[PDB]
Amino acid sequence: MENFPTEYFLNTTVRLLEYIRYRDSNYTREERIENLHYAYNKAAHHFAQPRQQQLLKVDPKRLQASLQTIVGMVVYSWAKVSKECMADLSIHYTYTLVLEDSKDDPYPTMVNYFDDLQAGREQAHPWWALVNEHFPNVLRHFGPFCSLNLIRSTLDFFEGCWIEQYNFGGFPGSHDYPQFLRRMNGLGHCVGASLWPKEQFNERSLFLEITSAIAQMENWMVWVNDLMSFYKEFDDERDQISLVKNYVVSDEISLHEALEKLTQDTLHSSKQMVAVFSDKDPQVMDTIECFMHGYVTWHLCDRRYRLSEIYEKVKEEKTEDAQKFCKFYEQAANVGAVSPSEWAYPPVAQLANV
Amino acid sequence: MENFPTEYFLNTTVRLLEYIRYRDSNYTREERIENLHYAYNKAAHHFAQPRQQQLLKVDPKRLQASLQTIVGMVVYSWAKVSKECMADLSIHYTYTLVLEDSKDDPYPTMVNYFDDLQAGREQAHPWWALVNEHFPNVLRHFGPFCSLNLIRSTLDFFEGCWIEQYNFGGFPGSHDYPQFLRRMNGLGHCVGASLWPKEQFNERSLFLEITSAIAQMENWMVWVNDLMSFYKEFDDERDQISLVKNYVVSDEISLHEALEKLTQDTLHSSKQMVAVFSDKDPQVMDTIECFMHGYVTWHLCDRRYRLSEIYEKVKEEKTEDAQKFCKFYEQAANVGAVSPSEWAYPPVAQLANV
Ligand SMILES: CC(C)=CCC[N@H+](C)[C@H]1CC=C(C)CC1
Ligand SMILES: CC(C)=CCC[N@H+](C)[C@H]1CC=C(C)CC1
Ligand SMILES: [Mg+2]
Ligand SMILES: [Mg+2]
Ligand SMILES: [Mg+2]
Ligand SMILES: [Mg+2]
């Protein structure tokens, strides 16, 4: 491509939103804010601890911005979990996001990974040291099966970040590479399994549905991002190994053909997602529907994805899509547009400096 | 039908061995046997230890049969790894095969999985106790990156077996379930990464190729089995939740449509497998080609897959398939057909009983 497929983007987006049934919720801005600040505050105090401040090498400003981007995603998507749950999930997912930062080679620190694990000795890699130490606060909200899923997916993620360091889009013809990588660093099963706290659900009772949820949520969650994230990533010459971009390199297809591959999967996933869970345990479909809608809300609201920019362009345009989009956007805006000043405070740096 | 597409089976298989370039090797029967007995002997002595004999609850006969099925698969596929390597890999993969047996619910034993792991306390589940204890002998043949892969994939496998106990083929319409499950219990990355001992390869030097190998081998390895295993697996009352069978249940398609899907993926995988690695480091393509051919050899040779039965019903036909099928089957049973009496002895029970 040359310029952004604005309209095509609009169409697909609108379609995605319809398929999932993007409608208003009883999750008020007062509530969103209540939770945002709760989660943010617990996390902030956590990342402000000296030990964390030391072992986690991250630019203060990025830790701040990342923590905020995470708390938002969690609060807006795990709408049904408890406040403490959102908090602890926020701390975990902030750790994972921060790891994408380290340029440092894992090799030397991963050499005795298994021996130290089995021995109970703190890991050599500082990230694992902090993360595995904190993990119990996340795992306490879940049952054994879901916990196993969170554990695995996180391990998966670590490897993903490692592979990512090589900035490799796959050898041309290596068709299986792209999705292999996307799943590797997508945290699919972590997200999927983290949607079912043992306080509101029963793994054994809903094993089949939970397992199915994980299986399906994994792809929906990553593809919806790759999709809605396509606008911010379009011109970012720094971001060179994204799913779509790798489809191009590995499958040797046009950036458009690749974008098409994505949209198709995204939609199909959405459809089947609804098809499967609609007539299932109401409490399930609920958590599932809330996550999907919240996930889309957050994407549309976080400046990280600069979607507000495509809002202006098609704002006054009088076509169908352009309008259906703006309506949806405006929808989310009313519940999701919240000035950080209302919840994200004080800054992590400040709590730390004390 | 409740019959068996014997024709498509033969055709697909040929196309398969053709794509992979199924040709003779310099891996003589004397050599195969030398390795078979080496691996078997080390493993046998291992599984005959009192601790192992206790914690691993398996019917002696099955442990015996399984151990033999594993040693064979390894020796015939990891043709380039050292003898000790094949041995240790045999011990690990025998553990994984045996786990498919336990009908026991993992839940209660997995409740403190993470806390015991981080603390260095032996796992509650006896399998993990034995497997994690032994793991170092497997991991010593690899570098940190490949080790991580073996570790993850094995964890993945454990979950797979858990999900398997529910004998669930997926909710109709849950299109992403099948492959999710297949990969979960396929040991894809374990196999893929175990092909590169640090004694013959350099993870850092061949990171890109090794990573790509894992990414591609994962699907080829599982699909080729699902394919060649489509025999002994169908006329069953046990593992009724196979990949193909689940495609049917989840994608709501005919057993034939499902079978064609597999064969399409299997071939394509094969095609690209060759396309990608041919012009790559010769030593790589070599390990890769040997694994593929050996993997097919072993399937054709192990009783477990009863492929000898389709040999007879075609050992005398005209089609360029039933004939071009035995042309290989023959070769297979030439360097691969080996009476257990020549290597698998004494029996594990015997060493144990002493
Ligand atoms: C970057 C964010 C928050 C979301 C985009 C989705 N990603 C596929 C994953 C990236 C790492 C995390 C923490 C969660 C999910
Ligand atoms: C089952 C066997 C031995 C070979 C075919 C491939 N499997 C599907 C894999 C999963 C289970 C193991 C133990 C090994 C590899
Ligand atoms: Mg993206
Ligand atoms: Mg990114
Ligand atoms: Mg099979
Ligand atoms: Mg099986």
Swiss-Prot record, chains A, B:
Pathway: Sesquiterpene biosynthesis; trichothecene biosynthesis. Changing C190F: Increases the KM for farnesyl diphosphate by about 1.3-fold and reduces the kcat by about 2000-fold. Changing R304K: Does not cause large changes in the overall structure but increases the KM for farnesyl diphosphate by about 25-fold, reduces the kcat by about 200-fold, and leads to conversion of farnesyl diphosphate not only to trichodiene but to at least 2 additional C(15)H(24) hydrocarbons. Mg(2+) 2 binds at N225, S229, E233. The gene is TRI5. Trichodiene synthase; part of the core gene cluster that mediates the biosynthesis of trichothecenes, a very large family of chemically related bicyclic sesquiterpene compounds acting as mycotoxins, including T2-toxin. The biosynthesis of trichothecenes begins with the cyclization of farnesyl diphosphate to trichodiene and is catalyzed by the trichodiene synthase TRI5. Trichodiene undergoes a series of oxygenations catalyzed by the cytochrome P450 monooxygenase TRI4. Mg(2+) 3 binds at D239, I241. It comes from the Eukaryota. Benzyl triethylammonium cation (BTAC) acts as a competitive inhibitor of trichodiene synthase reaction in the presence of pyrophosphate (PPi). This is Trichodiene synthase. It catalyses: (2E,6E)-farnesyl diphosphate = trichodiene + diphosphate. Its EC number is 4.2.3.6. It comes from Fusarium sporotrichioides. InterPro entries: Isoprenoid_synthase_dom_sf, TRI5_ascomyc, Trichodiene_synth. Optimum pH is 6.75-7.75.
